[PDB]
Amino acid sequence: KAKSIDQATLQLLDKAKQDGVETVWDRKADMKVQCGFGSAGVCCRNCSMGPCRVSPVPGKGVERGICGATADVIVSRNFARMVAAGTAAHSDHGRSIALSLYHTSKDGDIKVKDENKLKEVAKSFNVETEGRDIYDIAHDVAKEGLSNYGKQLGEVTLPPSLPEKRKELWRKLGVYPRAVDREIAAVMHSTHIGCNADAEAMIKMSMRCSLTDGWMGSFMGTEFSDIMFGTPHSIDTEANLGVLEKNSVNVVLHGHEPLLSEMVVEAASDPELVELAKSVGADGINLCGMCCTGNEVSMRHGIKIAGNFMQQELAVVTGAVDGLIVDVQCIMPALAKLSKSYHTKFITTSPKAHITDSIYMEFDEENPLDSAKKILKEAILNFKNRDQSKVMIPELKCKAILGYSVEEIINKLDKVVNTQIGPMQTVKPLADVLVSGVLRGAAAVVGCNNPKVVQDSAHIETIKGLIKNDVIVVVTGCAAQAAAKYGLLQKEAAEKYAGPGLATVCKLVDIPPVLHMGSCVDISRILDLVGRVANLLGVDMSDLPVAGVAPEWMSEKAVAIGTYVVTSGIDTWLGVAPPVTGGPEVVDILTNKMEDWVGAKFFIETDPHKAVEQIVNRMNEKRKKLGI
Amino acid sequence: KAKSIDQATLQLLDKAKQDGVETVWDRKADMKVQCGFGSAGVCCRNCSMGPCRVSPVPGKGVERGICGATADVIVSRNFARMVAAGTAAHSDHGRSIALSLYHTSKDGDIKVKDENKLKEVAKSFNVETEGRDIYDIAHDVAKEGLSNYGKQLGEVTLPPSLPEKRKELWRKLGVYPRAVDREIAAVMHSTHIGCNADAEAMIKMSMRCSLTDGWMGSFMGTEFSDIMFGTPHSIDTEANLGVLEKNSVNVVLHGHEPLLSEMVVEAASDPELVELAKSVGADGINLCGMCCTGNEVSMRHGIKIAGNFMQQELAVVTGAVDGLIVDVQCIMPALAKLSKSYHTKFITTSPKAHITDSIYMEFDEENPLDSAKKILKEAILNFKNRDQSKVMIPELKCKAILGYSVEEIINKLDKVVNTQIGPMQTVKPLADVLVSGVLRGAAAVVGCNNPKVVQDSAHIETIKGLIKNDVIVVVTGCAAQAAAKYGLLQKEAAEKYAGPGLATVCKLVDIPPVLHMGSCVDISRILDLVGRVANLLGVDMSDLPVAGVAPEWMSEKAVAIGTYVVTSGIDTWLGVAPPVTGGPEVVDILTNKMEDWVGAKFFIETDPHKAVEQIVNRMNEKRKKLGI
Ligand code: SF4
Ligand code: SF4
Numbered sequence A, B: 001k002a003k004s005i006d007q008a009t010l011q012l013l014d015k016a017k018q019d020g021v022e023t024v025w026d027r028k029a030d031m032k033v034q035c036g037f038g039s040a041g042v043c044c045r046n047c048s049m050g051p052c053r054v055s056p057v058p059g060k061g062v063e064r065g066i067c068g069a070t071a072d073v074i075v076s077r078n079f080a081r082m083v084a085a086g087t088a089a090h091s092d093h094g095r096s097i098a099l100s101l102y103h104t105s106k107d108g109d110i111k112v113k114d115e116n117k118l119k120e121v122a123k124s125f126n127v128e129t130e131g132r133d134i135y136d137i138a139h140d141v142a143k144e145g146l147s148n149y150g151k152q153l154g155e156v157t158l159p160p161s162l163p164e165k166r167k168e169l170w171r172k173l174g175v176y177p178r179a180v181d182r183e184i185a186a187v188m189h190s191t192h193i194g195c196n197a198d199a200e201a202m203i204k205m206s207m208r209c210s211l212t213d214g215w216m217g218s219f220m221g222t223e224f225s226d227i228m229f230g231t232p233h234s235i236d237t238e239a240n241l242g243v244l245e246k247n248s249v250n251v252v253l254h255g256h257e258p259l260l261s262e263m264v265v266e267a268a269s270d271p272e273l274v275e276l277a278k279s280v281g282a283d284g285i286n287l288c289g290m291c292c293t294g295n296e297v298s299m300r301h302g303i304k305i306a307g308n309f310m311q312q313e314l315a316v317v318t319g320a321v322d323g324l325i326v327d328v329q330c331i332m333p334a335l336a337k338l339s340k341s342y343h344t345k346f347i348t349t350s351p352k353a354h355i356t357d358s359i360y361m362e363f364d365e366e367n368p369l370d371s372a373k374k375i376l377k378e379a380i381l382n383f384k385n386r387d388q389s390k391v392m393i394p395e396l397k398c399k400a401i402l403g404y405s406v407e408e409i410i411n412k413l414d415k416v417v418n419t420q421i422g423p424m425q426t427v428k429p430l431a432d433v434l435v436s437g438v439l440r441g442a443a444a445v446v447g448c449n450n451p452k453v454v455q456d457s458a459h460i461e462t463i464k465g466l467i468k469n470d471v472i473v474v475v476t477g478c479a480a481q482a483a484a485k486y487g488l489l490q491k492e493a494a495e496k497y498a499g500p501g502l503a504t505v506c507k508l509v510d511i512p513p514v515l516h517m518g519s520c521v522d523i524s525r526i527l528d529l530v531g532r533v534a535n536l537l538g539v540d541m542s543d544l545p546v547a548g549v550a551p552e553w554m555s556e557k558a559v560a561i562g563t564y565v566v567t568s569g570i571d572t573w574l575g576v577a578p579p580v581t582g583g584p585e586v587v588d589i590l591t592n593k594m595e596d597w598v599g600a601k602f603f604i605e606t607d608p609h610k611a612v613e614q615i616v617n618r619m620n621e622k623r624k625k626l627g628i
């Protein structure tokens, strides 16, 4: 099987073979046939009476663990713990953002750059704004956001875009969210030996936990990031490994937390550091981003995107990365080993993510700019250790357009609003094109890479099929970066891949057929958008012809995302089977009974063409239900 | 090998064999050779790139997971998640207790029964008490306790018994606790794929999380339970399955949450329910407790203890249990299946612990007494379905003495205080006997049963060895219940098993050589006691000749307990190997390097006699260090 559809990826894999270094593909091959029990989710290790493995085939072999737990119980608890872990990752990201908001000041390193956005958020949090200092408002907003994480009395605060009907449905179902850390703790408590042994209740607890990610953690992280670093607008950038410069210092930012990458971008324009880069013999400083931190700095500043998850190692294989600065999440620990074969400084900066044999330079949030300058100076000084004979940068990079926040999308939609009719600054043109049938629907393509799928193949095939069927596509994360590398994030792509209705819409609004809405936490934006559409049409989000796809997901964060997208009322297709096939009841809940609960359900489909067909059929049947 | 050392357990196992029902022992046999990878902790399932298994033997086979994680990384993350799960269980228990405290009223079902204890706790939480209504104080105290769970700004509140030196050591090490749910979330975040890949940092994060269990969650749960339901004092009870009555309704309370069992005890004295029990042909109502809820009601009211963890099924095998009421934690799901073979009504009461095919009667905390009354009425009415031909209650019961809270221990120690010297109401007599060497030390025996060990064998052998070596023993949980069944919780036991110094101390103070300090959350009491001793001697808790033992542990809660006991500075012996042998670095950290950080470390010893010898040697070493 081919390892990737990306030519630059293939060239660097040949180079890695020539250099005698191992990749994620090599380790996947070394793992050989993976354990069937773990793959089906019928293995349990929740107590030291175990490990227990029960048969993935009902009626044969061992039926219960030592405590008496069935295959359905073991599967449901394993799934719930994946959701809890994903929720924890996203919530910790949002908590750091809220703490940064709490420390903003007029003369400090972290300021308020979008005051209108802050005032709207303050309105959503019942924070007074009129005749008040902007930083007093910011601190009050940060306090309310922080209380969302750990309040023990009262109800949490949810964005106004969330329909009232969806909230009432959640309350009736018993999944209405509480404080984020409280829900994570509840899931961890109920999976403990001898607690919850009922699959339906376990799945409902996991949905309840995932809601605190989708609508509170990721949402607050995104909106506070907009407040502090600016709301994204349409902006040009370049993507894929070709963005590395042979004659410049190459600094690659990998990870998820945006404050460090924002401070590194600011430090790169420091005159002393630019002079130092010139003095070490480089033309300048070339900042490139990877994964979600790359998505953030690219959405807000046009920083070039070096690559997505399964390309991170190959970035080092070029031999041109002088510094690789990582914060947390989706940072392959093998990088520490791999950087030994090159001059690269692999720099960890977060106390949450220590990696053995990496260079640890703790990013100081109290003095973010000075700390970022010190880290960047280490990367720049490493340019003297470059071995130019080992350098091979593929001449493969692609132009991309991104920055499509909900605000930017609304601004673009204002173009097709007749001034004599109005209203302006709404999602009404999008609702109109969806209701009329010019657009069949909207689909979110999100998720990681996975060695089980030819890298980027499923993302590209799913996106092309959807836009060919007049389904407008919004992309986040590594899927968005796969689209960027391929060339879908271009206005020209409208006439090259889209169907007639979507091509007309793209021409009228002057947008690409695929809209890059940011990082994984920025999936909250997608929720926001859908909610607005629903609130404009007076229906629940489960009545709309919308869907989400995770063609190549790998992370626990992806599991939590799919769970809260389904719980919000949006059908979700998974291109990688989750470890639930061992529990028939869990499969039936996720793919059949969920529709009775929240009006949406999971679809497991490993063939992208079949997934596109199923998405189109499901959207059409929801349209016929809605009468459009 | 033998299944148990308890004769009543053996008789009921013979009955279960005759009845054709399977027990935990049968399921353990069916599991056969358990997976070596999971047993060593070298299996990972944290992302869907996996499952990954690496060699438990370094230098052989597959070395890294697909992401590049080493065996040490996989082991450390698995261990950290066990700690997080145990912390979540204990913290959820304490959170329910704090909410119950917040809802106390003068004329309500839940009142304040120990005002002096509440005022001392309010002093510890900086809550004013002079000239204030008692319930206003209770509500303020509950608010402070709840803030300990989810505060995002500021420092948490810790009990005054914790030495200042231990706090400073924690701060220097970087494990000083934050809010409980925040620490659980942090641990779950750092184990996500591509985050923390450094074993030392991972272990430190797990220690930090476990501290929020030992000193905040369990501590607050215990103290608020004392405030609402009364501080335990010396009280007599009976233990083992013989406490069941053939001619009475038998109601067995299983689980951990004390509010439900307290309300059931109160409802059992209701005249209407007693009349109803008479009308169904029963002599009366016989409440019996199991596991930690049994420990709570037994400590506070002398409710008979039917048995510990691995006896729960056998309680049903008698055929005399009319109603088995369960709340959360350590409730074998197999009970539901087992209940079909008898008339027993298996009643789940908590939304956190749904069990398939059990009768669900949600315990309403808004009206706790009425809810308990209706649940108890269902149990009483089930007496008409008793089949007396299937009833076999072994005539094996044992007298026990319990109720040894720190307050009760201090009251007992006041007897050996010369009035002309004093002071009174301190732990000074205990400190004196420890310093003089009349007592060699104090050891806490805690933990569950585990089919891997002959049931109760390790508990009894460890306790007898320790008290024979003039080590006073405090017991909690299922170990305490094993001691109760065996007969160690008796004054006579002092002259039958204890060495000369401990026998003299028991005679002078009029206590058993083994002190039952309550449930698993009541291990906080042990911490409290040790802290007081340390504060009286002006030393850290790691300088004292104290130790903790978990001879037969199984639960994630036990892992968290051992972790915070070691982190507090108390050496801990584990009678069951935790899944860490696959990671050499993790083994070295837990058993060797930990002593450099916190002055204590783990000891893994599956032979109880060798464990007693090692405990005595380590205590003598610490005495020689201290000069006593
Ligand atoms: S919780 Fe039950 S099924 Fe899981 S390892 Fe423990 S005994 Fe086995
Ligand atoms: S999933 Fe379970 S059975 Fe399979 S290798 Fe891992 S621990 Fe062993």
Ligand code: SF4
Binding pocket: B044, B045, B046, B047, B048, B049, B050, B051, B052, B064, B065, B066, B067, B068, B069, B074, B192, B193, B194
């Ligand atoms: S986190 Fe790493 S070691 Fe664990 S399953 Fe995923 S790829 Fe394998």
